[PDB]
Design a protein around this ligand. Structure first.
Ligand SMILES: Nc1ncnc2c1ncn2[C@@H]1O[C@H](COP(=O)(O)OP(=O)(O)OP(=O)(O)O)[C@@H](O)[C@H]1O
Ligand SMILES: [Mg+2]
Ligand SMILES: [Mg+2]
Length: 390
């Protein structure tokens, strides 16, 4: 792969905030970015050098994108893998459709991660309604109480149903329209972390520090880096697990692997995203090379960047709920951005979305400081200010 050098066109399938941040990283290095996204008001399409407003399966637009761009990547884990393979007919596509197909499918994902030598949650695969009917109650009960999760198309905790007994499993599967699912045992979690790596076509790789992640209602709330409760041994183990997965997958791009640390201290892989990840947004303000710049470098065959963290960091997600301090049934209130910007540690990132809605990711604030405790205090003060915490 002769390197694709600055000045070239790079393609981005998906136009959310991840694609928008990719644009800034690519444009700062002198690349031009074409974003393919069906939405008029796409956050990435808004800043891209070119916006192809098209469905992800539109043949003419994929052909146009691959003709224009020397390399293409994605910011959308649920993108059709067949679209990436169609693009790969005429341009370089990083990560490959086959890699995305594994990562986007919980059944394939658990099988692949386990096959890499990495522990996953105890679970039962439910391939179909007919297959579930053939499973006896005891087989389900071994992983109960648990969570029934659709194998495809889930995000932000959607497509997941809590289940406490076999009858609830069968009713839940009908409630999910019978799609392939994984039934996972609910595990006693002590904390959650994510490993963030980038891998080049050559097999060279880089690793970020471990991120410690807190979720609210299944949605990422904040990230603390370096993970304060992860020993150097656990950090190395989680990084090595992510690199082993990426190596076996032949992955080229940025990969994020989420893990649980259980109350007994064991490390359990949860899932992986074939793309930059919300838990990696801190790298923009805290590390020499951001995850978005690694995505540029991997897809162009350029050398991977240094991951040095120059500053401890906390990322706080900003959901649309912040706009409804008097509840969702009452008028929106513009958040107090002037008071956020008055905090020395605060790095405000707003995605340009017009309509605040509850559950919608509207931006994030990174807090960097000389010490982690100062960044954490600042993130806590801002969370109270925004009514994220009491
Ligand atoms: N087996 C489990 N045991 C305990 N908690 C779990 C389990 N599976 C998921 N959770 C909790 O639910 C959160 C969301 O689950 P999961 O990662 O499967 O959903 P998602 O929609 O794919 O994720 P994301 O929030 O990254 O889009 C996990 O971070 C964890 O807090
Ligand atoms: Mg996944
Ligand atoms: Mg997750």
């Amino acid at each position: 792969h002769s390197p694709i050098l600055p000045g070239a066109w790079l393609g981005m399938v998906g136009g959310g905030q991840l694609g928008r941040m990719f644009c800034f990283a690519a444009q700062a290095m002198g690349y031009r970015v074409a974003v393919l996204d069906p939405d008029e008001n796409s956050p990435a399409g808004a800043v891209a050098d070119r916006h192809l407003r098209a469905a992800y399966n539109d043949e003419a637009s994929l052909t146009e994108l691959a003709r224009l761009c020397a390399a293409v990547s994605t910011e959308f884990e649920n993108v059709p893998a067949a679209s990436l393979d169609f693009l790969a007919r005429t341009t370089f596509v990083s990560p490959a459709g086959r890699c995305v197909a594994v990562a986007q499918d919980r059944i394939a994902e658990k099988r692949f991660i386990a096959s890499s030598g990495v522990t996953v949650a105890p679970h039962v695969v439910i391939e179909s309604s007919d297959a579930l009917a053939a499973l006896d109650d005891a087989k389900l009960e071994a992983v109960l109480p648990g969570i029934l999760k659709t194998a495809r198309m889930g995000y932000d905790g959607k497509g997941q149903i809590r289940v406490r007994n076999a009858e609830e499993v069968r009713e839940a599967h009908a409630s999910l329209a019978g799609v392939p699912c994984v039934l996972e045992k609910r595990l006693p979690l002590k904390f959650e972390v994510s490993a963030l790596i980038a891998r080049a076509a050559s097999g060279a790789s880089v690793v970020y520090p471990l991120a410690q992640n807190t979720h609210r209602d299944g949605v990422l709330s904040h990230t603390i880096v370096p993970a304060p409760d992860a020993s150097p041994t656990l950090v190395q183990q989680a990084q090595q697990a992510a690199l082993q997965i990426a190596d076996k997958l032949g992955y080229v791009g940025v990969l994020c692997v989420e893990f649980f640390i259980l109350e007994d201290g064991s490390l359990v892989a949860n899932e992986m995203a074939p793309r930059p990840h919300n838990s990696g947004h801190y790298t923009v303000d805290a590390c020499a090379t951001s995850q978005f710049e690694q995505q540029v470098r991997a897809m162009t065959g350029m050398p991977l960047g240094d991951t040095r963290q120059h500053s401890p960091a906390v990322m706080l997600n900003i959901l649309g709920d912040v706009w409804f301090p008097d509840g969702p049934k009452r008028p929106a209130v513009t958040p107090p951005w002037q008071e956020v910007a008055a905090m020395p540690a605060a790095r405000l990132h707003l995605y340009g979305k017009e309509e605040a809605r509850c559950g919608r990711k509207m931006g994030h604030v990174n807090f960097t400081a000389a010490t982690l405790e100062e960044a954490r205090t600042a993130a806590r003060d801002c969370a109270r200010l925004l009514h994220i915490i009491t």
